[PDB]
Write a protein that holds these residues in place. Structure first.
Motif, short mmCIF file in Angstrom:
data_model
loop_
_atom_site.label_atom_id
_atom_site.label_comp_id
_atom_site.label_asym_id
_atom_site.label_seq_id
_atom_site.Cartn_x
_atom_site.Cartn_y
_atom_site.Cartn_z
N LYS A 1 0.82 -1.23 0.00
CA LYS A 1 0.00 0.00 0.00
C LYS A 1 0.86 1.28 0.00
N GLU B 1 -5.82 2.88 -4.85
CA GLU B 1 -6.69 2.92 -3.69
C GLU B 1 -6.98 1.48 -3.26
N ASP B 2 -7.21 1.32 -1.96
CA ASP B 2 -7.51 0.05 -1.31
C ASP B 2 -9.01 -0.22 -1.47
N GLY C 1 -10.64 -2.68 -0.06
CA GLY C 1 -11.14 -3.21 1.19
C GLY C 1 -11.14 -4.73 1.34
N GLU D 1 -10.73 0.02 10.85
CA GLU D 1 -10.06 -0.17 9.56
C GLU D 1 -11.02 -0.54 8.44
N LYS D 2 -11.97 -1.43 8.72
CA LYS D 2 -12.95 -1.83 7.72
C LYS D 2 -13.77 -0.63 7.27
N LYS E 1 -12.88 2.60 7.49
CA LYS E 1 -12.01 3.55 6.76
C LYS E 1 -11.88 3.20 5.27
N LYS E 2 -11.73 1.91 4.99
CA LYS E 2 -11.62 1.42 3.60
C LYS E 2 -12.90 1.62 2.81
N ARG F 1 -13.33 5.08 1.35
CA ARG F 1 -12.49 5.40 0.19
C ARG F 1 -12.00 6.85 0.24
#
Ligand SMILES: *[C@@H]1O[C@H](CO)[C@@H](O[C@@H]2O[C@H](CO)[C@@H](O[C@@H]3O[C@H](CO[C@H]4O[C@H](CO)[C@@H](O)[C@H](O)[C@@H]4O)[C@@H](O)[C@H](O[C@H]4O[C@H](CO)[C@@H](O)[C@H](O)[C@@H]4O)[C@@H]3O)[C@H](O)[C@H]2NC(C)=O)[C@H](O)[C@H]1NC(C)=O
Ligand SMILES: *[C@@H]1O[C@H](CO)[C@@H](O[C@@H]2O[C@H](CO)[C@@H](O[C@@H]3O[C@H](CO[C@H]4O[C@H](CO)[C@@H](O)[C@H](O)[C@@H]4O)[C@@H](O)[C@H](O[C@H]4O[C@H](CO)[C@@H](O)[C@H](O)[C@@H]4O)[C@@H]3O)[C@H](O)[C@H]2NC(C)=O)[C@H](O)[C@H]1NC(C)=O
Ligand SMILES: *[C@@H]1O[C@H](CO)[C@@H](O[C@@H]2O[C@H](CO)[C@@H](O[C@@H]3O[C@H](CO[C@H]4O[C@H](CO)[C@@H](O)[C@H](O)[C@@H]4O)[C@@H](O)[C@H](O[C@H]4O[C@H](CO)[C@@H](O)[C@H](O)[C@@H]4O)[C@@H]3O)[C@H](O)[C@H]2NC(C)=O)[C@H](O)[C@H]1NC(C)=O
Ligand SMILES: *[C@@H]1O[C@H](CO)[C@@H](O[C@@H]2O[C@H](CO)[C@@H](O[C@@H]3O[C@H](CO)[C@@H](O)[C@H](O)[C@@H]3O)[C@H](O)[C@H]2NC(C)=O)[C@H](O)[C@H]1NC(C)=O
Ligand SMILES: *[C@@H]1O[C@H](CO)[C@@H](O[C@@H]2O[C@H](CO)[C@@H](O[C@@H]3O[C@H](CO)[C@@H](O)[C@H](O)[C@@H]3O)[C@H](O)[C@H]2NC(C)=O)[C@H](O)[C@H]1NC(C)=O
Ligand SMILES: *[C@@H]1O[C@H](CO)[C@@H](O[C@@H]2O[C@H](CO)[C@@H](O[C@@H]3O[C@H](CO)[C@@H](O)[C@H](O)[C@@H]3O)[C@H](O)[C@H]2NC(C)=O)[C@H](O)[C@H]1NC(C)=O
Ligand SMILES: *[C@@H]1O[C@H](CO)[C@@H](O[C@@H]2O[C@H](CO)[C@@H](O)[C@H](O)[C@H]2NC(C)=O)[C@H](O)[C@H]1NC(C)=O
Ligand SMILES: *[C@@H]1O[C@H](CO)[C@@H](O[C@@H]2O[C@H](CO)[C@@H](O)[C@H](O)[C@H]2NC(C)=O)[C@H](O)[C@H]1NC(C)=O
Ligand SMILES: *[C@@H]1O[C@H](CO)[C@@H](O[C@@H]2O[C@H](CO)[C@@H](O)[C@H](O)[C@H]2NC(C)=O)[C@H](O)[C@H]1NC(C)=O
Ligand SMILES: *[C@@H]1O[C@H](CO)[C@@H](O)[C@H](O)[C@H]1NC(C)=O
Ligand SMILES: *[C@@H]1O[C@H](CO)[C@@H](O)[C@H](O)[C@H]1NC(C)=O
Ligand SMILES: *[C@@H]1O[C@H](CO)[C@@H](O)[C@H](O)[C@H]1NC(C)=O
Ligand SMILES: *[C@@H]1O[C@H](CO)[C@@H](O)[C@H](O)[C@H]1NC(C)=O
Ligand SMILES: *[C@@H]1O[C@H](CO)[C@@H](O)[C@H](O)[C@H]1NC(C)=O
Ligand SMILES: *[C@@H]1O[C@H](CO)[C@@H](O)[C@H](O)[C@H]1NC(C)=O
Ligand SMILES: *[C@@H]1O[C@H](CO)[C@@H](O)[C@H](O)[C@H]1NC(C)=O
Ligand SMILES: *[C@@H]1O[C@H](CO)[C@@H](O)[C@H](O)[C@H]1NC(C)=O
Ligand SMILES: *[C@@H]1O[C@H](CO)[C@@H](O)[C@H](O)[C@H]1NC(C)=O
Ligand SMILES: *[C@@H]1O[C@H](CO)[C@@H](O)[C@H](O)[C@H]1NC(C)=O
Ligand SMILES: *[C@@H]1O[C@H](CO)[C@@H](O)[C@H](O)[C@H]1NC(C)=O
Ligand SMILES: *[C@@H]1O[C@H](CO)[C@@H](O)[C@H](O)[C@H]1NC(C)=O
Ligand SMILES: *[C@@H]1O[C@H](CO)[C@@H](O)[C@H](O)[C@H]1NC(C)=O
Lengths: 173, 317, 173, 317, 173, 317
Positions: C123, C131-132, C134, E120-121, E123-124, E127
């Motif tokens: 990352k 971009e992540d 998820g 964290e979940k 936050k992803k 985007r």
């Protein structure tokens, strides 16, 4: 090592940081500097002292016990005396070996965690005014003199003040 | 232009190796030793009452071997027996020596009250050339060697009641003469039989005349026995000869006391933990000095070092 | 499971990855590919072998002991012989049960950690060029052929080269 | 268009269940067994010196029961006793059989030096029809049955000094005749008394005439005793009859040796760990084969399996 | 504490959240609300029940043993009986002390982990439509009514729908 | 305007303190006690068969002291001995009392089959004024006091074979008379000798005439011994006086049974774990109620509380 900071994305430690365990190095317009973070340092130290409290100075009193050395062959009763003590010593030796190995794994991991937490806290603070270079360093996209760097170390950095300047430098061609 | 802000951690030039779950050798910035592996060589005289046995086993002091007269009525947290110690009175054995040793050691006192036993009909205070006290012939200070009065040894039947609040510990014995002649000389009949008894217990002993290999030139032997008499119970000695009678009783307590074999000198110092190699500090949780310990001591383990990391992983430049 | 990668944000493992424990799958202009990451894989394997070193082939020698089976009733001394051995066996059985359960919890967590570290390293490498999504995947906002994907797997990806192209694709309407 | 880059981990079709702190059943990619639970069935003859007792208890070989003559002077790391074994000499008992067994086993040798005991005044080498050696009447090879010479049994008083660097272990006994007639026939007086002694110890034994239920048609009995004689000490046997005397002494050592009850065949193979069920591999740290072990062995635990995860959690498609 | 969420970047817990262990508070155009996350809550609870299963109701049967109290002085054999039992009790006492301390350290850490994973979940999911304020809260750069907030809690939030609106608000002067 | 979305966790107003690796005092939302530290005070009569000894030691019931006649042939998982218990028959002692107690307790039955012993030549069923049964003079119900028939006590030589599938446990004894007169009165000769024997074992006992301090006004004593006779073996009692003979044998089993000293009342309730303070619940893994336990019990530890966290760290507003 389990968090990936110490002996991971931080390539090595700093021998010239002698006033703390964790800290900040910077380069800006006024030069190149270093400072310790006390809170991180103390968090790790307190936890290690917590372990030491449980292990140092907590011994148990025994008085009259059994004989554990013998000048004559006797057979049955002495076999059983020897066996009991040998049994006791192996189980305590096992306890001591396991303790040290678990505590050590955990100390290495908590110290790495404290480093990771300081990196994460700092990353959030900087908001959109900086990017992570992947080696523990942030590229800050604005003029950041010693008072500015100071404000980041002290938790008082106001990111809105530099946001315009930084977004512009960040997304330029 | 902007700026650069790097996060880091310290490191040292002199790392130490520790063991972990995943790796037997990883370098950390600092560590502390958890196994105590040394002594000064001295048994510290505080904070436990140390009694240096010197030339005497605990048993010799109990019986009253003449070089052990300094030990009369003394107390101890730890009695220390020396390997050079030797007996120099009448040659004896104790069946279950270790159990008598243990229970006296654990009681932690040699306090002795005398009692007036009704020994009418015999000659008390018998002596011998193998048990010297100030150049005279003598005997075990706490025992009473009964012989004939006018070539007559009547049947003894002596009672001693425990009317006290505490246990009494009685030490007594049986003479085994060297020859048939000596049996007649001392007791005026053929070998007797002793029977010491209480309401809850009885010990009968058969004397056995015969030669044993000479110990300090003496081929006869005394066999030592013991008897605990509870409150409201009574001692009863039945005998037709060969009785080495008690002059009284030992108080028996419970407590912290014990005994240790060691040749360490006694120091003027303070130390909670004692081993046969000397006292050891008790800051550490483990030790490999000796499995025999007394006091507040670290626990004995086979390992000679165990390093606990007190710092992060050391990662040099 | 404690890091949230394996059996967390990575939905499942790949049965068709047989040359490593951790790795990369990609889709680009040249097709759809897979490759193992050796370093992550070896990091986890070394740690598990470290545990095995402490447990395999480290047995202790005993010789003459005490009797543990008896053909006659005897009372006191045999009760005490039986009791000592029963005591010893329960404490060793306890040690073995606890060892396996702790080591297993820790192995599951270190393996999850190694996955999380590889995701985090990747990352950072991609900077503002991706971009992540998820679920362990990155949307890369530029043309990234096999040599480009290769450069990310190999730690040689130069993010400045694609930055213009990516920022533009990222912040378009 | 761009690209997609996914990070992942492997998985397998054949997962194994392991236990954790938080969950008794979680599937991992791979695991290794930590409890050894099987044997081949054989006691491996290397690397320990195995001595197969066959028809003889250790004690029978010690005494010299005639089917045990092959065992004279042999050594062992592990002596193996078989359940089919039986005695076929004079019916005997040993008070504290287990202690004599244990100390011989642990010494690990049957090495026997003969000594010239001064038995003038009696007939040596007594025999019996219950102890057959090559169809002749015989006796325990290491013992000496003394009877009268010319209907006279004088008082014995025989000395044997230990002038050696090592301990000597003396095995001896007492005949308890079946009838009063046999007591006169063999020893020419009413039941004697034995007294074996040293400078530190004495054992007196009373023979007791009477019938016991017949064992291999013999209602008499021998009671076996033992005596350890240290350097600079002396053995002394006093007797007026009924003495089953020693022909000499056994060396007593310390070492790795012991004894095990088993019916496993001895194999030509190499294996560090021995149990009564056979040898077992020692790669694993634990075993549930037998609590009785010898050598470098895994530790005995009650569990029959313990799976250590050697892979990550298995999460199939 | 090892992940840095509970008693770290989350300043304190919420006493007024009584229907779950972990959850969401929001402020939007329709007001200020709260809701529990069941999945996080259940993940932590299941793991703690896993520990309890191993400890509650798993006792061992013993029957005839040895004597452990004595009305008479006896010496050797009683010393050895007393010593064996004292030895057994200290090793079990050690086992119980260590168990509780390790399990407790691990429970505190797994609960912190579950919080970090939910952060964290989330936050992803958001985007480029939100930024992390550093205290567990996200500033969402678009109109986000109760159905929108609902869609984030439920894992159904479509970030492409608000992306234009958010990027514009995010990178304005 | 936009929106704000905060992630958080719960907290409680009533936290509890727990211990951790790094900190002896950290507050968590919730916790559960792992040390059971209380009892109701009662021994629950289920699910184990409890036998309340009341006034009788196990041994008194074994022998057949007259207040213990209710205990004939009874079984138990746990026999409970009370501290108020006392003997009220002929004053006795048992050498190795603890071993006989233990083995009976562990067998868990008092089942007694009588046998027809060939006691021709003597008077059976001897009685005494110290062993009262319904105001008459009586004796130990399972023992047989043999005296002279017509001032004659012939030499006894009585055989009893074990032809059964199980062990037989024989309890017998030796009278030690108070005076020489009583020895002649009861047995018509000077003190005898007993010799109980089997194919594998022999026990010879010497009676010893003499006075012991009176217990319930009786200065004589009986010394109790025991003998286990295996299948295909034979009991053999040899005697010339002083025999307190068995009327038969006890079956000896193996099983779950034992014995406990306690003064707790027996309740009508169900509880798997028993201590001397009462039954305790066994939900928890540890307890500090008593080191003496029976059944499925928590393990005894020195700590009086151990708090396991069952919730996250509590961090109030
Ligand atoms: C590497 O890691 C170890 C462990 O973390 C560190 O060693 C500890 O360091 C501290 C501070 O230097 C030491 O604290 C001092 O303890 C003294 C007592 O020492 C004796 O007794 C203890 C047991 O009770 C033993 O462990 C020890 O061996 C000694 O026998 C105190 O007397 C000291 O007091 C002084 O300072 C205080 C200030 O508050 C004053 O009040 C006093 O007047 C006095 O001047 C002090 O508290 C501690 O002993 C060390 N522990 C161990 C186990 O060794 C190292 O510091 C670390 N190394 C590096 C380079 O960081
Ligand atoms: C699942 O998890 C387990 C454990 O992590 C893995 O099993 C191990 O696999 C390795 C490699 O396959 C094995 O290594 C080999 O060990 C041999 C010795 O085996 C004996 O002795 C040991 C104890 O000393 C016992 O554990 C074992 O049961 C045997 O009795 C060596 O002889 C092998 O040597 C060969 O390769 C080397 C290459 O360096 C050559 O030099 C030699 O000539 C020879 O050809 C080898 O080193 C190891 O034994 C396994 N351990 C255990 C505990 O079983 C599985 O691989 C893994 N499964 C999967 C699918 O990944
Ligand atoms: C703080 O932390 C503790 C532990 O995590 C929590 O306590 C547990 O709470 C649950 C639910 O309230 C309890 O579950 C109940 O168990 C009962 C059995 O109790 C007895 O037996 C057990 C051992 O077997 C002992 O531990 C206990 O002390 C008792 O002696 C059941 O009978 C209950 O059944 C009821 O509900 C079910 C619903 O499925 C119905 O089928 C039944 O009909 C019945 O109505 C129930 O299953 C559990 O006992 C508690 N454990 C412990 C160790 O105490 C606390 O809840 C928590 N506190 C807070 C505020 O969160
Ligand atoms: C059974 O035999 C033993 C061993 O021979 C006899 O004991 C021995 O007795 C003699 C004296 O009678 C001891 O002699 C000593 O010699 C030294 C010379 O240095 C002298 O100083 C002494 O005064 C003494 O006379 C000899 O040492 C001694 N040996 C032992 C081992 O005790 C024993 O007397 C015999 N039994 C009977 C009942 O006679
Ligand atoms: C006390 O009583 C016992 C038991 O009766 C006596 O022992 C018994 O003695 C006889 C011989 O005297 C044994 O008889 C044997 O018979 C077989 C027949 O198969 C024969 O082959 C033998 O030669 C022998 O004669 C009998 O078995 C034996 N029993 C036991 C258990 O030993 C004992 O002799 C009596 N005591 C005294 C002192 O007499
Ligand atoms: C050795 O001496 C003891 C102690 O003196 C003798 O035992 C004692 O014997 C007398 C009777 O002969 C007991 O007297 C009792 O007095 C009470 C008065 O309340 C009376 O009710 C009884 O009927 C009885 O006469 C005395 O208590 C008793 N003491 C003990 C401790 O047993 C013993 O008899 C002497 N040995 C020989 C062989 O004579
Ligand atoms: C403490 O003293 C003991 C004495 O028993 C030492 O242990 C013995 O050491 C010798 C020679 O070093 C060995 O041959 C023995 O195996 C040991 N004896 C026993 C019974 O184990 C020990 O080395 C001393 N320790 C210190 C630190 O001085
Ligand atoms: C090894 O041998 C022992 C023999 O003692 C076996 O354990 C016994 O097994 C029997 C029948 O299976 C049980 O009734 C007994 O309870 C066991 N005896 C004892 C004393 O525990 C054992 O099963 C064998 N193990 C292997 C792997 O062969
Ligand atoms: C259970 O009973 C035992 C009785 O042995 C209690 O332990 C004794 O308590 C007394 C007084 O409180 C102490 O002086 C002794 O040190 C204890 N005796 C022994 C042998 O340890 C115990 O307190 C009782 N426990 C409960 C929960 O009732
Ligand atoms: C940061 O805090 C320290 C307090 O020790 C102070 O010396 C420094 O001036 C502060 N700087 C800023 C910019 O807040
Ligand atoms: C490293 O050096 C310092 C200074 O000489 C010393 O006091 C310290 O204990 C050393 N640390 C280690 C871990 O060796
Ligand atoms: C102890 O005995 C030795 C000789 O064995 C002697 O040198 C020393 O003076 C004696 N000391 C005492 C106090 O008896
Ligand atoms: C015990 O003493 C009494 C009275 O003096 C006497 O009659 C008896 O013979 C003695 N018995 C023994 C065994 O000494
Ligand atoms: C990546 O490294 C491997 C080395 O095994 C090599 O095969 C590959 O060509 C490299 N590619 C790039 C783009 O660096
Ligand atoms: C899975 O299958 C392979 C190939 O047959 C086998 O060797 C391996 O040991 C198996 N692994 C497990 C964990 O069952
Ligand atoms: C062992 O004894 C049995 C009979 O009991 C016999 O068959 C076998 O040949 C004997 N072997 C030896 C070596 O004595
Ligand atoms: C011991 O031997 C001596 C000398 O032959 C003799 O006078 C004595 O009676 C013997 N004693 C015994 C108990 O055998
Ligand atoms: C979220 O899910 C819950 C299901 O309990 C439902 O009540 C709510 O309406 C859902 N909202 C949205 C926007 O998906
Ligand atoms: C807190 O209060 C509740 C409600 O009264 C109670 O049931 C609960 O057990 C308490 N929890 C703790 C940890 O004290
Ligand atoms: C037990 O004995 C006491 C007196 O010691 C008596 O009060 C009670 O009634 C007796 N009970 C039984 C059942 O024997
Ligand atoms: C002896 O006692 C029992 C039980 O009281 C009785 O039935 C039996 O007939 C008596 N036997 C003789 C021989 O008197
Ligand atoms: C044993 O009984 C027999 C036969 O009645 C007799 O000859 C012998 O003297 C008895 N022996 C003893 C010690 O009672």
């Amino acid at each position: 090592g389990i968090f990936g900071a110490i002996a991971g994305f931080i390539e090595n430690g700093w021998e010239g940081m002698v006033d703390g365990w964790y800290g900040f190095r910077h380069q800006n317009s006024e030069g190149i500097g270093q400072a310790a973070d006390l809170k991180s340092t103390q968090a790790a130290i307190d936890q290690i002292n917590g372990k030491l409290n449980r292990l140092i100075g907590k011994t148990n009193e025994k008085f009259h016990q059994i004989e554990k050395e013998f000048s004559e062959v006797e057979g049955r009763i002495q076999d059983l005396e020897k066996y009991v003590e040998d049994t006791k010593i192996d189980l305590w030796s096992y306890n001591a070996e396991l303790l040290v190995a678990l505590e050590n794994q955990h100390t290495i991991d908590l110290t790495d965690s404290e480093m990771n937490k300081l990196f994460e806290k700092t990353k959030k603070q900087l908001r959109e005014n900086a990017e992570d270079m992947g080696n523990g360093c942030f590229k800050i996209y604005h003029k950041c003199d010693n008072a500015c760097i100071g404000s980041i170390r002290n938790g008082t950095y106001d990111h809105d003040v530099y946001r315009d300047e930084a977004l512009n430098n960040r997304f330029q061609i | 232009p902007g700026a650069t802000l790097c996060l880091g951690h310290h490191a040292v030039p002199n790392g130490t190796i520790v063991k972990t779950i995943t790796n037997d050798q990883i370098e950390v910035t600092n560590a502390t030793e958890l196994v105590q592996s040394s002594s000064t060589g001295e048994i510290c005289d505080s904070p436990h009452q140390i009694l240096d046995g010197e030339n005497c086993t605990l048993i010799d002091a109990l019986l009253g071997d003449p070089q052990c007269d300094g030990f009369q009525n003394k107390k101890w947290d730890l009695f220390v027996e020396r390997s050079k110690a030797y007996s120099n009175c009448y040659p004896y054995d104790v069946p279950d020596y270790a159990s008598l040793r243990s229970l006296v050691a654990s009681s932690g006192t040699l306090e002795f009250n005398n009692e007036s036993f009704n020994w009418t009909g015999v000659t008390q205070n018998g002596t011998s050339s193998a048990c010297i006290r100030r150049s005279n012939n003598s005997f075990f200070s706490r025992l009473n060697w009964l012989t004939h009065l006018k070539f007559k040894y009547p049947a003894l039947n002596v009672t001693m009641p425990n009317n006290e609040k505490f246990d009494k510990l009685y030490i007594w014995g049986v003479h085994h003469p060297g020859t048939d002649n000596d049996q007649i000389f001392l007791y005026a009949q053929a070998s007797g039989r002793i029977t010491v008894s209480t309401k809850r217990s009885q010990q009968t002993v058969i004397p056995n005349i015969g030669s044993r290999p000479r110990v300090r030139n003496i081929p006869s032997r005394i066999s030592i026995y013991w008897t605990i008499v509870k409150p409201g119970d009574i001692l009863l000695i039945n005998s037709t000869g060969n009785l080495i009678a008690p002059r009284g009783y030992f108080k028996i307590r419970s407590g912290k006391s014990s005994i240790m074999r060691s040749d360490a000198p006694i120091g003027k110092c303070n130390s909670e933990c004692i081993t046969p190699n000397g006292s050891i500090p008790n800051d550490k949780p483990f030790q490999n000095v000796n499995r025999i310990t007394y006091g507040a001591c670290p626990r004995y383990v086979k390992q000679n070092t165990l390093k606990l990391a007190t710092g992060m992983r050391n990662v040099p430049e």
